[PDB]
From a paper:
Transthyretin (TTR)3 is a 55-kDa protein that aggregates into amyloid fibrils under pathological conditions. Here we identify two segments of TTR that drive protein aggregation by self-association and formation of steric zipper spines of amyloid fibrils.
Familial amyloidotic polyneuropathy is caused by a number of TTR mutations, including L55P and V30M, which we examine here. The combination was also effective at blocking aggregation of the familial mutants V30M and L55P at physiological TTR concentration. Also our computations with ZipperDB show that TTR familial mutations do not increase the propensity of fibril formation (data not shown). These results support the hypothesis that familial point mutations destabilize the quaternary structure rather than creating new amyloidogenic segments.
Author numbering:
A (entry chain B), D (entry chain B): 10 to 125
B (entry chain A), C (entry chain A): 10 to 124
The structure:
Amino acid sequence: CPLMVKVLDAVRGSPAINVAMHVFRKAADDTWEPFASGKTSESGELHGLTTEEEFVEGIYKVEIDTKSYWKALGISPFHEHAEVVFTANDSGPRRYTIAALLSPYSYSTTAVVTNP
Amino acid sequence: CPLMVKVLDAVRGSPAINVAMHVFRKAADDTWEPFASGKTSESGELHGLTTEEEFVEGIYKVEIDTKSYWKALGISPFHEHAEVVFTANDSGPRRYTIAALLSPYSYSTTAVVTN
Amino acid sequence: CPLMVKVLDAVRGSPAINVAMHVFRKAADDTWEPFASGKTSESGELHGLTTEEEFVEGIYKVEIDTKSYWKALGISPFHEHAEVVFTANDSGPRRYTIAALLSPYSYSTTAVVTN
Amino acid sequence: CPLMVKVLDAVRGSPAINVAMHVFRKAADDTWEPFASGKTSESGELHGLTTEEEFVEGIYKVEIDTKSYWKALGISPFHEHAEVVFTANDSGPRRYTIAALLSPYSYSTTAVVTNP
């Protein structure tokens, strides 16, 4: 699994479940092409977005729909979404774990990059 | 000053100086329109991006060039940039302070909204 | 002002007002000695904790009463408090700003050390 | 496993490996009694600190030796340690995952609390 995303809720102290996210890859013309999408599980994780063969070198963007998540909980949050834009596999193939911690007016994102 | 951005460096424990950022506003046609830009001062702050008259309700994006910042320091970063996308809403008088804390492989952002 | 503490609320997007905190200094016998204390202002800041003459090198602890803050807001928190333990070191003139960002189940702290 | 700790390094984008930590429990006289300790694995995790029978209600403190971690990497960090002080199992038994993200001048801690 080359790309995994984990989302946590800092208000409830729990995984952020059923959070939608969309992954895009930058094309040669500088436009964002849809690449993959899914929703976090009961553990706040989203696995299986891509495969080693499909996840080629490039610039990727993960847009996490945090606004719909907070709205479902009765909160009007500050951000429209939480994101990560990064270059993947430019110095060889890697496994990427993107972790996001959510609050109504704040978010943090971190990456764990390991050699397969 | 209705919009202020402050950027901190979690590696050096200091303000993040000379960090470039661009602000965009989403137009009725769903496109991002350039709105303002600048670079952080010696205090890690960027003031004067907009005025009360110009800063109307809408969806705004602040793209912070974190990658060039880390490259200038000789540190290999993860993110291409740090985005902050938010709706500006009139609900009494409001001023927005966007604070970003930067690390090579992580960033955090918060908003302080005051009256 | 050699030591300043700023506290922000990530749920309300505002300064964290009337937050109590106690500062301790580790003495030669390994015990924690009370050093200073106060409550954050309407701007979420606590200034005037110490002076340049009093703030010598040593190991200091700032215990922020986050639990009472969340309880006052009717939100069930995780942490009893947020500690910040650090060494103050003379390496040219220095001023310390401790910034804490609070959520019910999480907190972040950073230091901005300037000359 | 009622208590698990995960530590990440925000400078290298990796798990924080071989990080020492000590867990204390507050006694009736308000003093901190040593409870458990260990070091994070190659995955930045520390499992098996306690058992369901031993992990009774109380106030606990996890002190993570972040200073020795940064010093081993050639960095003189700001904090002496990263910590979490919390009341455990006061409203029934729970499983606690403490996550810490480390930078030389900053740290973040979050808890994921789930019902067994």
